[PDB]
């Protein structure tokens, strides 16, 4: 369960855009600065920038 330090505006069809304070389930975070998160609000998947998120 990570937190999006800020609303992330994705630009590709791989990462999803989140908001500040939004919670996203982290999936794979060992590739680089991009991990695959899963929004629990609707139920979708989309990478996310580690600099806009933090481990809570």
């Amino acid at each position: 369960t990570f937190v999006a330090l800020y609303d992330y505006e994705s630009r590709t069809e791989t990462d999803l855009s989140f908001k500040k304070g939004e919670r996203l389930q982290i999936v794979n975070n060992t590739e680089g600065d991009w991990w695959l998160a899963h929004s629990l609000t609707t139920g979708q998947t989309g990478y996310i920038p580690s600099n806009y998120v933090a481990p809570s």
């Binding site: 330090l5 800020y6 992330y8 505006e9 600065d33 920038p49 580690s50 600099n51 806009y52």
Partner: peptide
């Protein structure tokens, strides 16, 4: 496969 400009 660059990160965005943090706020």
């Amino acid at each position: 496969x660059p990160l965005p400009p943090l706020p």
